[PDB]
Amino acid sequence: QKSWIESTLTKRECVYIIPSSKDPHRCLPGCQICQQLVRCFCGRLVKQHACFTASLAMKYSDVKLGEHFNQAIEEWSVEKHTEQSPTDAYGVINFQGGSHSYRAKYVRLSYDTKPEIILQLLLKEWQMELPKLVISVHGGMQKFELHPRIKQLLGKGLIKAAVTTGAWILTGGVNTGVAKHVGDALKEHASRSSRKICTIGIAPWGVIENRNDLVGRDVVAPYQTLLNPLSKLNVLNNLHSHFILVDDGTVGKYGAEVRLRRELEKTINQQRIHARIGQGVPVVALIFEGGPNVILTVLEYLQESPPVPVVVCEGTGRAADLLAYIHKQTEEGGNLPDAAEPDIISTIKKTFNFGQSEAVHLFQTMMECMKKKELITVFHIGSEDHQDIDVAILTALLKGTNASAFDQLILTLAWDRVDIAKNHVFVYGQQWLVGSLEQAMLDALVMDRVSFVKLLIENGVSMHKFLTIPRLEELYNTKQGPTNPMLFHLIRDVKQGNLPPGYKITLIDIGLVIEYLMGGTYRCTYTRKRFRLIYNSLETKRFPYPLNELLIWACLMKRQVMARFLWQHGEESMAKALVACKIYRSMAYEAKQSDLVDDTSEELKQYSNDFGQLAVELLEQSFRQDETMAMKLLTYELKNWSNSTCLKLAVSSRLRPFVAHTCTQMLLSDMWMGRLNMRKNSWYKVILSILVPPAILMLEYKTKAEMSHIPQSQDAHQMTMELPITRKFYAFYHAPIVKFWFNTLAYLGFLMLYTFVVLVKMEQLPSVQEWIVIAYIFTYAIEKVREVFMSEAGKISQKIKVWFSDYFNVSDTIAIISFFVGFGLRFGAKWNYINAYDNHVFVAGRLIYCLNIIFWYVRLLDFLAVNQQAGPYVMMIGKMVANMFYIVVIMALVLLSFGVPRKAILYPHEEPSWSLAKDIVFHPYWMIFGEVYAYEIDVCANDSTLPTICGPGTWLTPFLQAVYLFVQYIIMVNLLIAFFNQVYLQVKAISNIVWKYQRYHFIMAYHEKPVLPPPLIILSHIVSLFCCVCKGPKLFLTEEDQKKLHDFEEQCVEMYFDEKDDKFNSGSEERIRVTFERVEQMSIQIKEVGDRVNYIKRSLQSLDS
Amino acid sequence: NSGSEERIRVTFERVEQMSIQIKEVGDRVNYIKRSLQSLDS
Amino acid sequence: LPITRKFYAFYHAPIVKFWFNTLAYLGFLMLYTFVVLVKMEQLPSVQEWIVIAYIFTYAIEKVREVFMSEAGKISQKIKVWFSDYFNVSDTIAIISFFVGFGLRFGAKWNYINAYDNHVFVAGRLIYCLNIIFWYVRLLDFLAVNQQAGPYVMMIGKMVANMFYIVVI
Amino acid sequence: VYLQVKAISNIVWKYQRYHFIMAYHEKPVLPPPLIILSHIVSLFCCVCKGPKLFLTEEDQKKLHDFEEQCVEMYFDEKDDKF
Ligand SMILES: CCCCCCCC/C=C/CCCCCCCC(=O)O[C@@H](COC(=O)CCCCCCCCCCCCCCC)COP(=O)([O-])OCC[N+](C)(C)C
Ligand SMILES: CCCCCCCC/C=C/CCCCCCCC(=O)O[C@@H](COC(=O)CCCCCCCCCCCCCCC)COP(=O)([O-])OCC[N+](C)(C)C
Ligand SMILES: CCCCCCCC/C=C/CCCCCCCC(=O)O[C@@H](COC(=O)CCCCCCCCCCCCCCC)COP(=O)([O-])OCC[N+](C)(C)C
Ligand SMILES: CCCCCCCC/C=C/CCCCCCCC(=O)O[C@@H](COC(=O)CCCCCCCCCCCCCCC)COP(=O)([O-])OCC[N+](C)(C)C
Ligand SMILES: CCCCCCCC/C=C/CCCCCCCC(=O)O[C@@H](COC(=O)CCCCCCCCCCCCCCC)COP(=O)([O-])OCC[N+](C)(C)C
Ligand SMILES: CCCCCCCC/C=C/CCCCCCCC(=O)O[C@@H](COC(=O)CCCCCCCCCCCCCCC)COP(=O)([O-])OCC[N+](C)(C)C
Ligand SMILES: CCCCCCCC/C=C/CCCCCCCC(=O)O[C@@H](COC(=O)CCCCCCCCCCCCCCC)COP(=O)([O-])OCC[N+](C)(C)C
Ligand SMILES: CCCCCCCC/C=C/CCCCCCCC(=O)O[C@@H](COC(=O)CCCCCCCCCCCCCCC)COP(=O)([O-])OCC[N+](C)(C)C
Ligand SMILES: CCCCCCCC/C=C\CCCCCCCC(=O)O[C@@H](COC(=O)CCCCCCCCCCCCCCC)COP(=O)([O-])OCC[N+](C)(C)C
Ligand SMILES: CCCCCCCC/C=C\CCCCCCCC(=O)O[C@@H](COC(=O)CCCCCCCCCCCCCCC)COP(=O)([O-])OCC[N+](C)(C)C
Ligand SMILES: c1ccc2c(c1)CCC[C@H]2Nc1nc2ccccc2[nH]1
Ligand SMILES: c1ccc2c(c1)CCC[C@H]2Nc1nc2ccccc2[nH]1
Ligand SMILES: [Ca+2]
């Protein structure tokens, strides 16, 4: 068929002919007039029954000869005299003209379609996602009129209480009924032009203009609404999406459409809201101005089961007025003022031009309405009764379908309307069965409903009680909500295989992810023997600190808005925002690496940097409250996050705005001093004390009450507890600043000797100055061997990979290898006694030194970068050398553009040679640097150093060179200058941060560097290794000092979440925003109130007169 | 006192304290007219 | 993906069409340069015929680039071809080269001493100067990069805007 | 004139890139020493006798639904930004 729509659905056509009129108004032989003016109970004319066999049944008059027991026919059975057929219509209405050619859809189906057959097209054919609500509108069919307030206010709600939910509004479609006014709201309050509220307007095939235009299989019906008042067929209202053109076989008349409307409104109450919720999608009913049949069908809902509620609004008009007028009377139904039933019937008499014989049962119909004054939510539009109508509808469903507060909560959890919950469920005395609240948290978590999580926490859900092992196993193992495909890709990687078919994730498998994401030696609670034993076993089946487990969940499941919510709660907020930043960042790098799904990788690096900026903005807030304790917050062992540190994490997330913040730069300096007080002391005295060891004793140290915030080593804290003299030499030599200035004076004694050897002639054997030099590099090599073996990891593959990843561990390896190549060729060589420097092996190693020397002078930029003025230029000399490579390629294209012609034009008798590789590159390079070779330009001139190069064509080179240098100096060299000017301020505000971040890795290499410099560091290796064959810097806080510190972090977080609140709520652009929103809501209650005053004074002067 | 950022500050604080005595006062008016039309009727 | 659709998929990729020219052109500039720099005999050498061959087939590739430049007006095709910086320079560089080969090959030979024939010399020196047109091509190829090209485009927008400082 | 010409030479470059890439979609396969074969084997074969987006039918439909969607947002976000 190529169309499932017409494969399943059918169409009704009057396949028989039933006249309904006999009397010849004109032209006594009725056969003539019966052709054109005698219609069937088919509605269509007897000749409009084409129906090819029935077209030949346009015989003399038609089927059933004139007499035929005259009153015989007059029935038109819709069963056999109206058969079915495959649908000839199905398309997309264009609505040509009125707003950007808004679309809608239809089929033209028969009402034969069983209720379940009608639901199983709306979802899968038209891709209408299942609703959370249904706002069938059962008011007046004939057009009616409203007041400017109620017109727009009810247009606020049908947009508000339906855009939030799914809200398949059920209308009549036509531009005359309630369908009329609802569409007018859809334009005035035009929502964000998107999939807005998809109104599913059931239309009859009866009162419909352009019915022929609808007859097209996959046809864009060029539809146009004529407002011709002479017209009688009702045009479809403009603002309606998908239509259901119910086909009864007839035209012009009502009927079948009402049958479908129950029969879809009853199966959508049989479909479930969501996999998590067990309820069915509820149904409401709204009444605008009603009518006689309306007052009947309003009631039957209040009677029939399930109790479909109703939202009959009072202000609209004729019927709805009185159905609400009686709500102001008839208290609890059965109680009935018998003196008012003549009065209200007198109001019924005047509105419907209504009869008194019929005044008992219509009045009676309003009684059982009033016997059910519990779910008939008579919205008093006038006042603030129950709220704006948006809330009234959603409030009508909860209060009235005999539903537990849980069952009320699970619905609002689906709608994602919290305001309903805070003010109609979390109101007052209410049963709140505690197990229920727990189960609701399980649902708000799996989806993403942060706002109900906050709500439930703020109404008694202690996560300690609600975070057991099997519950949290689900929270990873749910497709019932926003999911991250990485997590099921990470787990199958670490398991090194393929997940079995079902595979509910175990929390062990998560630990193997976070220990892989965070990395290094991070060891999570899940993998440890305690958890791994109580887990396989199954308040021990709870967790100690739950929001540390949910925060690693919302960050593996890419639920930021939860992570920001679960981060700000709990404790350790600065370690949670630097673990998160390391989880995401370590997820983002997996995304870029493996491409099995969409990228997602820049969505995370923005999520990480959002956590890696709350930490930094929380360090500042602490550093601005107590600079001392705020440096304890960076070094206290955490013990929930793998015996780690709020500053070793940032370094692992490579977060520079923290490691290069001013509190991680004081501490790094207070750690750089050591026990020394280099505030009271001076750098002269360090060097003076290193070479005069007794001068160590004339130094101003710090007390162990000043070194509180500094992390100290294992035995370092042992000393201070249990200043004596042996604790002066230990305190100095184990200071980083001393470890530094005790190397820099061996290294600057290395470079003064190796340089002395490089420069001075070199004999068969090394000299005293040269053995000390070999000795440094050897012991400096070992110091880098040992720097690998003790680089705080278990994976040799990862230690070696992080060692060579630092700029100098390579260069040192280049410089250490080369030197022993050098010593290899220098010492491991023969000796040509008659003349040294003939042995090209000796020479070779000789010249390894003279070039290896350059590696060691650039070391000094490691030592020289300790300064805060210098280092940020040493880091610039690299960030330009990179960013300038392409200006410099051009300058080498300009250099061969000149050198190849200059060398060809001048030296034309050149056999192939390697000097043709120098001479095309040599002079044009020195030209850039002040040289011009002036007596070589114009080689035929008298003043020539090259009077032999003169010959045919050599007059071209002054021109080539003129163009060359113009391009070099006046264009390309000033393109460098211009480059270095405009990349200076950038690279200067980066090379600082790159420097302040390499400072960590520099200082915290001296806290584990030995004491002794690398000529005689070997003793501190000897006396660390043979003693090792016989068998970090932590913050030691007593017990109360942990307590005072936690009280400080809590205090500083509280201010952070309180000052941001102030900087925004008490800014300017926000303050203009409120002043706008106030003066909005003022001016409404100005003109409204001020009107009423004038309606008083015009009366008050008439009351007295 | 006659700048801009300060003048937005006051205009905020005024429209705060206005709007309190708008809705409060404007309520009471409606509680009169619903009565006044019933005092005479 | 079948095998014949691997070779068709690669060789008909632009990135491949590029890096399959830039390694013929950088093999052109390594040879023409070799000929420019090295002495030049009565007849071209192996390194020099390949060079003539590139420019010829590179000329045709620019002939055909006109005839298939998506238009009907020859007056408009030719006008949009010469309107690009290099279609001129290439025409300067292709003409000049065959002027060069014209004078280099279409010339006599003073056996006692080359470089006396000022026609030979003349074309010899067309090459040594035509070479500059082909090194500036590399700024067409080198401008594919998003860091480099935006300097190659600066070296022109300054040479224009600086003419008057340079007259002074 | 560096910051000017740098915020222009990018745009001049990104615009010559079209005319560069979309010259290779119609450049032959073979480089210009032996592109002649792809001329030979385009011309004598021519004596014997562009890059388009091939969308099925539904993909035109999904694309038009996308353009309509993105225009609607454009005329709706400007409305909000002001
Ligand atoms: C004395 C006579 C002989 C020597 C004189 C001649 C010496 C010649 C010159 C020498 C200059 C030496 C310094 C530069 C080399 C890299 C240093 C480094 O750590 O780079 C990186 C390690 O990046 C890695 O991926 C890990 C290891 C890379 C090793 C590459 C060696 C290249 C040099 C070849 C061997 C040359 C030895 C020649 C001798 C046989 C660090 O990062 P980055 O570099 O800042 O940025 C790159 C970023 N990246 C990490 C993502 C990649
Ligand atoms: C943290 C990790 C990074 C650091 C790496 C550390 C490791 C360093 C890496 C080194 C790798 C480089 C190769 C080894 C060097 C020698 C190569 C060579 O050419 O030797 C020559 C000498 O060979 C001899 O045996 C005689 C001289 C003594 C050798 C001293 C060099 C080894 C010292 C290493 C101490 C390192 C331990 C350092 C402590 C850890 C052989 O050739 P020849 O004799 O010249 O040829 C004769 C020719 N003729 C007769 C014609 C003249
Ligand atoms: C014909 C001549 C042509 C030119 C020849 C070559 C000369 C010119 C070149 C020279 C050096 C080339 C190799 C090293 C530099 C490359 C790396 C770099 O630039 O910076 C990078 C590393 O480096 C730094 O961040 C610090 C910079 C170190 C200073 C370099 C010493 C130069 C002095 C030598 C004096 C000796 C002179 C005497 C010698 C006899 C930083 O760059 P970035 O942008 O952050 O990139 C990302 C980095 N990341 C991945 C780590 C995050
Ligand atoms: C398009 C953009 C604008 C360009 C601007 C203008 C471009 C330049 C225009 C220059 C004017 C023309 C100069 C040459 C004139 C003829 C020379 C001649 O006959 O003999 C000369 C030969 O030497 C040469 O021919 C060498 C070329 C001259 C130097 C080129 C200029 C470079 C510097 C300036 C560039 C910028 C200057 C700016 C201008 C103010 C000398 O006489 P001779 O005796 O034959 O030689 C000695 C031999 N003998 C010893 C055996 C006897
Ligand atoms: C600008 C203000 C200054 C004045 C302007 C007025 C200009 C008046 C100029 C007139 C030029 C004609 C005079 C020379 C001819 C006579 C013979 C002669 O000397 O031949 C020389 C050829 O040298 C040349 O041909 C020189 C260059 C010619 C072009 C002149 C510059 C063009 C304008 C600028 C733009 C150009 C592009 C620049 C870049 C943009 C050879 O002589 P030689 O070198 O001594 O060699 C002798 C030895 N040998 C026999 C062994 C070989
Ligand atoms: C090997 C030995 C001999 C050669 C070595 C000596 C060579 C000497 C130097 C040569 C420099 C050659 C390269 C630059 C030429 C222009 C390139 C181009 O396409 O420009 C433009 C084409 O603009 C047009 O209007 C269409 C054609 C203009 C032709 C101009 C030729 C000028 C050189 C005369 C012949 C010289 C040949 C001398 C030889 C007899 C493209 O635009 P644009 O330029 O980016 O900007 C201008 C914009 N415009 C289009 C609005 C105008
Ligand atoms: C898209 C297109 C853009 C590019 C344009 C493409 C077209 C290229 C445009 C070219 C125009 C330039 C003029 C033609 C070149 C020769 C001029 C000359 O001086 O010739 C000389 C040689 O003449 C001979 O006939 C003998 C040598 C063979 C000639 C080969 C050159 C032509 C090849 C063209 C192949 C092009 C086809 C490429 C495919 C399209 C004549 O002078 P002479 O003999 O030295 O004089 C006597 C010397 N004596 C005194 C020492 C005895
Ligand atoms: C005495 C000597 C005095 C000086 C002599 C002369 C030397 C100085 C000059 C030299 C070159 C002069 C001719 C070419 C450049 C002119 C055009 C230009 O500037 O840019 C224009 C085109 O070009 C570009 O947009 C790209 C620029 C390419 C770089 C030029 C090559 C330089 C290298 C050569 C190395 C060889 C060196 C060795 C040689 C032996 C763009 O300009 P624009 O502002 O956008 O204008 C509008 C453009 N529009 C109309 C297209 C929209
Ligand atoms: C690895 C780390 C080691 C630590 C360093 C300490 C151990 C290294 C120390 C000493 C080792 C050498 C001892 C052997 C005897 C010396 C002989 C000698 O050369 O004498 C010369 C002086 O000395 C020198 O010229 C070289 C040694 C001193 C200067 C160079 C090293 C300075 C750095 C290290 C110290 C400062 C460090 C400060 C930096 C902050 C004098 O003799 P001459 O010049 O040949 O001429 C004599 C006259 N005659 C020829 C006419 C007869
Ligand atoms: C148009 C596009 C073509 C595509 C390219 C492929 C075709 C071109 C390939 C080969 C063509 C030549 C074949 C003939 C035989 C060679 C003879 C010869 O010169 O031998 C020399 C080597 O060769 C050279 O020095 C010149 C050729 C190779 C280097 C220059 C081109 C490199 C680019 C192309 C390739 C890489 C491309 C890389 C680009 C990214 C050796 O001898 P000599 O130096 O004279 O000294 C001898 C000394 N003796 C007398 C003592 C013994
Ligand atoms: C040349 C010079 C220094 C450097 C390099 C290259 C490569 C990266 C390592 C860096 N060294 C370094 N020493 C420091 C001391 C204090 C603070 C920051 C420091 N950074
Ligand atoms: C010197 C250098 C390059 C150029 C000129 C002159 C003249 C204009 C054409 C330009 N070449 C070019 N190649 C490109 C490759 C990629 C993207 C953009 C590109 N622009
Ligand atoms: Ca100078």
Swiss-Prot record, chain A:
- Where is it localised? Cell membrane; Cytoplasmic vesicle membrane
List the cofactors: Zn(2+)
Q: How is the cofactor bound?
A: Binds 1 zinc ion per subunit.
Q: How is it modified after translation?
A: Palmitoylated; palmitoylation at Cys-1027, Cys-1028 and Cys-1030 promotes TRPM7 trafficking from the Golgi to the surface membrane.
Per the record, the major location class is: membrane
The protein's Enzyme Commission number: 2.7.11.1
- Please list every transmembrane segment annotated in the UniProt record, as residue ranges: 735-760, 767-788, 808-827, 841-864, 884-907, 954-982
In this entry, the parts of the chain located on the Cytoplasmic side of the membrane are 1-734, 789-807, 865-883
Activity regulation, per record: Channel displays constitutive activity. Channel activity is negatively regulated by cytosolic Mg(2+), Mg-ATP and low intracellular pH. Resting free cytosolic Mg(2+) and Mg-ATP concentrations seem to be sufficient to block native TRPM7 channel activity. TRPM7 channel activity is highly dependent on membrane levels of phosphatidylinositol 4,5 bisphosphate (PIP2). PIP2 hydrolysis negatively regulates TRPM7 channel activity. TRPM7 kinase activity does not affect channel activity.
Q: Which residues lie within the membrane without crossing it?
A: 910-950
Q: Which family does it belong to?
A: In the C-terminal section; belongs to the protein kinase superfamily. Alpha-type protein kinase family. ALPK subfamily.
Q: What is this protein called?
A: Transient receptor potential cation channel subfamily M member 7
Please report the organism this UniProt entry assigns to the protein.
Answer: Mus musculus
List the taxonomic lineage. Answer: Eukaryota, Metazoa, Chordata, Craniata, Vertebrata
Task: Write the gene name.
Answer: Trpm7
Which section of the whole protein is represented?
3 to 1230 of 1863
